[PDB]
Amino acid sequence: KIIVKHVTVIGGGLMGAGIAQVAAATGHTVVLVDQTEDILAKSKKGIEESLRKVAKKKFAENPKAGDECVEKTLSTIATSTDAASVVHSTDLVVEAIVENLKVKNELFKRLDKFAAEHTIFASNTSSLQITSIANATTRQDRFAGLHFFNPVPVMKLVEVIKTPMTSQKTFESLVDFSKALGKHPVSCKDTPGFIVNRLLVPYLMEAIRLYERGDASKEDIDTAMKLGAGYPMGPFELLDYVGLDTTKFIVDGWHEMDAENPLHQPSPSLNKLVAENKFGKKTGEGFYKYK
Amino acid sequence: KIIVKHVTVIGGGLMGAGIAQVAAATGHTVVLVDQTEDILAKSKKGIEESLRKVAKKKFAENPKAGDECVEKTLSTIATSTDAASVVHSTDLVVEAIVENLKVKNELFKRLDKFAAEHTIFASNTSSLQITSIANATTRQDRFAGLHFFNPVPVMKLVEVIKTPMTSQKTFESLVDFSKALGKHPVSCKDTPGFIVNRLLVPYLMEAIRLYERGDASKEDIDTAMKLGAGYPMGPFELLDYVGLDTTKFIVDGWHEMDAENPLHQPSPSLNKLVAENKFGKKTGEGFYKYKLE
Ligand SMILES: NC(=O)C1=CN([C@@H]2O[C@H](COP(=O)(O)OP(=O)(O)OC[C@H]3O[C@@H](n4cnc5c(N)ncnc54)[C@H](O)[C@@H]3O)[C@@H](O)[C@H]2O)C=CC1
Ligand SMILES: NC(=O)C1=CN([C@@H]2O[C@H](COP(=O)(O)OP(=O)(O)OC[C@H]3O[C@@H](n4cnc5c(N)ncnc54)[C@H](O)[C@@H]3O)[C@@H](O)[C@H]2O)C=CC1
């Protein structure tokens, strides 16, 4: 097997930046790739701010060390706008770009030609068949899914998705990498939603339908699941937290893929909110109003 | 508005005993009912041990204070083998007996004749229609669902279920009663599973199906839902904790009422474990094996 040490993270967004941060914090050499220097500048600025917010609490008694820890970590992250020039000798590519299949395949189709031989390709996609991306390359045995959770530097869970073509050597290498990141890896096949979303999303939809049906108020439903099932957030609070458009996107995906299943049936309420651009906390309004 | 002060709890099992315990601990006069004096003696004993357990943890700094507390609560809990003998002067009847429609209807049909005019009737049932049970009486305006969660003394939620016939006054009085118990009441129509089970159970079934399908292990699924969704228990640990039989029962009912619905298709693994009489922590084994206490 291979020991991941040099990591190429493509996409410096919410997830990408988090992945690059944890990898660098855990002693991996990292190259963050995005489209423009400005995007990268902002992504790396965000990483630094996050690292400092932590350090100020952990190195309160010794601020010098705190600053070093931060510097050392940032210096271990490099940036580039050209993935091709970076993967020649990288051990792992973790892609977290726009959730679009075409764009993704083109990206990997191209990288497969420049990446080293031992290089492993992994996607952090939520609503896309890992296999539907692996096939865009001739490296399916070194291709898998590595699904993280927001906020990456906080959430310890990582889903290691193995396709029917993924090597066992590749799998274990990702399992070892996950642990080196200080994460707790779980295994799942390349099935829609993998584990978490597959069981969480349809339940969130069910909560909306119960409400749309007029069986109870959103407030009581949230209170019920928090006090009755011990959940951290009620379904509607959580829905606004993960983004209503983000959810709709995943459900429609499963609806088209299987318009017969009652769990993926569209929701008038959900659609309306998204329509009128009310996506949740990231807009100040979803099922509830914030800020 | 008549404020519930005297409560008759019918059924001294897991749920009724807890309801009785909480009502008694919050200043309500209580009468616990069950088939025999032994069952009752044992139920009340389980309530004492539960009280003494919390006492030795709340009154560590003064064991005597704890003793007084426990004794006071325990004393406000009378016991009777026939509820008909005390409902003529009770404000609320909370039933928590075997989950069987006919047995429940028979019970309430008879009590309807002894209960004071103002007395409210409430069932803690998880799978039966409150309306079905209410129509066993001629007191539907004073009939409703009052659904608790195990362990009752700990779970703060209570679902107040209103049938199309339940009166606003009956509803409000149960809402006030819930708060008086120190619980947080939520409202729901008389629909299958009300709020919690309707959203929880189908999810547990999906968990089993994902596993049976072989997409992931039970262990990984539990880890994933705990770390990924922040749940206190993975679905399989929760299934064993609430009872596999208890779960299968609720689902067969929904499947029965709508056999074409995919959400209620039975689970081979679930039926098998239940068939092997492996009901979870109850029997020392469910999806996981537990250390026989
Ligand atoms: N939003 C979430 O909480 C989670 C999302 N995901 C998945 O992670 C991926 C990342 O989504 P987010 O970080 O939230 O989105 P984001 O939009 O915040 O970040 C994506 C980044 O990708 C860049 N990008 C787009 N196309 C590119 C290309 N061809 N080459 C290089 N960079 C490109 C964008 O400039 C942007 O900075 C998606 O595949 C999504 O399904 C996975 C788990 C959780
Ligand atoms: N077990 C659970 O977690 C939950 C159960 N429930 C519901 O609450 C009810 C209570 O169930 P559990 O406490 O679990 O069962 P249980 O079997 O532990 O207790 C039921 C008690 O009812 C008594 N009983 C049966 N027929 C009777 C009659 N005619 N008169 C008086 N007592 C009679 C039994 O002797 C027994 O002590 C059921 O309807 C159930 O669906 C509701 C919420 C949660």
From Swiss-Prot, chain A:
A GO CC term attached to the entry: mitochondrial matrix
Localization, UniProt: Mitochondrion matrix
Binding residues annotated for CoA, in chain numbering: S50, K57, S126
Keywords associated with the record: Acetylation, Differentiation, Disease variant, Fatty acid metabolism, Hydroxylation, Lipid metabolism, Mitochondrion, NAD, Oxidoreductase, Spermatogenesis, Transferase, Transit peptide
SUPFAM superfamilies from the UniProt entry: 6-phosphogluconate dehydrogenase C-terminal domain-like, NAD(P)-binding Rossmann-fold domains
PANTHER family, alphabetized: HYDROXYACYL-COENZYME A DEHYDROGENASE, MITOCHONDRIAL, PTHR43561
The protein's name in its UniProt record: Hydroxyacyl-coenzyme A dehydrogenase, mitochondrial
Species: Homo sapiens (Human)
